[PDB]
Structure 1
């Protein structure tokens, strides 16, 4: 924008490019997302503008939504690092368990809030999770994919990651439930613990089959109505569920049982964020400070 001094290209989200910018009128530095266009739908703008009221300590504040010159700008509070970069930076040593637990806990808190307000994220991923030096982690781009419908690619024609996509989305479910975010967070929790993505699919079917290979091909027994889903094919290979202790070693039993609940196939059996906050895994949760290299 004309009111800002680009500092760096924070990155390039699925919807446009993101810039670290200083408000040459307030001096505060923000993350400025520029969105892609014959007029632009006002249905999507009111939905996003509603996100400005969704304020919580574990949600990146959406400062402004500006629609001008066929461009949509989203002004976000700036955090110094995303979880994907922090995980890469901790690749050799791994993120300490107390910090992983604190991060999971805070994210469930952020989700409990969004979901209690009927707002779903729909595209949770490490790059969407921002952390600060004080030990806080925050959800960002909350409710964005809603009024926009996830595009096959991004602005730079890169590639949308499906690694954190819930099985019902992959099977063509028309309606998303808050359960999709719990699934994504479960995948992230496992990745923080093991230092490797849980389901690194590079296509929709590869994603699906990677899920099936590990948790077993779902059927009417574990997931009623699954065989009636849009993209469900009776021809799907039938993989036996893998022993779970193999999925996230060496995570303890409490962590493992919570993760299994976050990864139940049936969205109805999948644990809610609120219930998860009461899980015994969080009996000794604390708030460690990360060692950040800014």
Structure 2
């Protein structure tokens, strides 16, 4: 690690620590994720993260550059991205993120997610803190979980998970992304729940309590209760007042209750909302 200078801690959990560093020789600016190695016939669990990053090489996925084994430590070296979308949303809350940028970011996120999904990989925890932007207008998927190896906000959690589904589909990530879309536009989290029930009922109150017509199978899910509160769906025009027709349409398809009817990543990319998509640079 002798070439890494200006090293400063930027993240930490029980399993990982993350730093910003600058290679003093190459000038490359990097993020370093430190993992402690235990005693090693079962594969060492850091291999999963490395494998996924290698497999998911893509312009809108965080880029693993190197792996450095030193003492009883492994350092994953990443290309450095300026900040996360959460920080960008907070910095842009007075004025809002311009619509051309929201559109570019949603498009890019859909491209990264379509790539994951084409490899049968589910993200499962999409949220602003797991999305990284650079100075040049790109946004990239990451998973900044530092609690454990690859192998808790509920705000972006799909309703089927909340209702006890044993099998997650690619639709769970589309739901999370719909919520993120809405949040970019309104400047506030769409479903900011503080527990499983509060989260579920926030969804029901905005979108209406689902029934067998809207979501065949809903009443048979493990944690469904026929005594659930019954709300009628709100005017979606009032849910995301700033969004135009094309925007509302796309969002309503990302937020379809039925995971089998929820729009896919690939099909979202062809929505008319994206017809005039460009690549604006954020002001940072």
CA shift, 1:70, in A, is: 7.0
Which 10-residue stretch deviates more, 62-71 or 188-197? 62-71
State the distance in 1 between where 2:189 and 2:92 align: 14
Residues 28/101 of structure 1: CA separation in 2 closer, same or farther (3 Å cut) = same
CA shift, 1:66, in A, is: 6.3
1:166-197 deviation per Cα after TM superposition (whole angstroms, max 9, x unaligned): 11122222221111111111100000000000
CA shift, 1:275, in A, is: 0.2
State the distance in 2 between where 1:146 and 1:278 align: 36
Q: Partner of 1:233: helix, strand, or coil?
A: coil
CA shift, 1:118, in A, is: 1.2
RMSD of the alignment, in Å?
2.9
State the distance in 1 between where 2:147 and 2:207 align: 27
Equivalent in 206, 210, 215 of residue 218 of structure 1: 210
TM value normalised by structure 2: 0.88
Whether the aligned pair in 2 keeps the contact of 1:52 and 1:64 (CA below 8 Å) is no
Residues 192/98 of structure 1: CA separation in 2 closer, same or farther (3 Å cut) = same
Q: Partner of 1:148: helix, strand, or coil?
A: coil
Which 10-residue stretch deviates more, 31-40 or 238-247? 31-40
1:19-52 deviation per Cα after TM superposition (whole angstroms, max 9, x unaligned): 2123467542222234579999636633642322
State the distance in 2 between where 1:39 and 1:6 align: 39
Which 10-residue stretch deviates more, 172-181 or 93-102? 172-181
Residues 13/112 of structure 1: CA separation in 2 closer, same or farther (3 Å cut) = farther
Q: Partner of 2:125: helix, strand, or coil?
A: coil
CA shift, 1:132, in A, is: 1.4
Q: Which residue of 2 aligns with 1:154?
A: none
Whether the aligned pair in 2 keeps the contact of 1:81 and 1:130 (CA below 8 Å) is yes
Residues 172/106 of structure 1: CA separation in 2 closer, same or farther (3 Å cut) = same
Residues 42/221 of structure 1: CA separation in 2 closer, same or farther (3 Å cut) = farther
Whether the aligned pair in 1 keeps the contact of 2:154 and 2:194 (CA below 8 Å) is yes
CA shift, 1:234, in A, is: 2.1
Whether the aligned pair in 2 keeps the contact of 1:52 and 1:63 (CA below 8 Å) is no
Which 10-residue stretch deviates more, 8-17 or 232-241? 8-17
Residue segments in structure 2 that go unaligned for 5+ positions in a row: none
Residue segments in structure 1 that go unaligned for 5+ positions in a row: 150-159
Whether the aligned pair in 1 keeps the contact of 2:131 and 2:139 (CA below 8 Å) is yes
Q: Which residue of 2 aligns with 1:153?
A: none
In the alignment of these two chains, the number of paired residues is: 282
CA shift, 1:278, in A, is: 0.5
TM value normalised by structure 1: 0.85
Q: Which residue of 1 aligns with 2:106?
A: 104
Whether the aligned pair in 1 keeps the contact of 2:131 and 2:141 (CA below 8 Å) is yes
CA shift, 1:14, in A, is: 8.3
Which 10-residue stretch deviates more, 45-54 or 107-116? 45-54
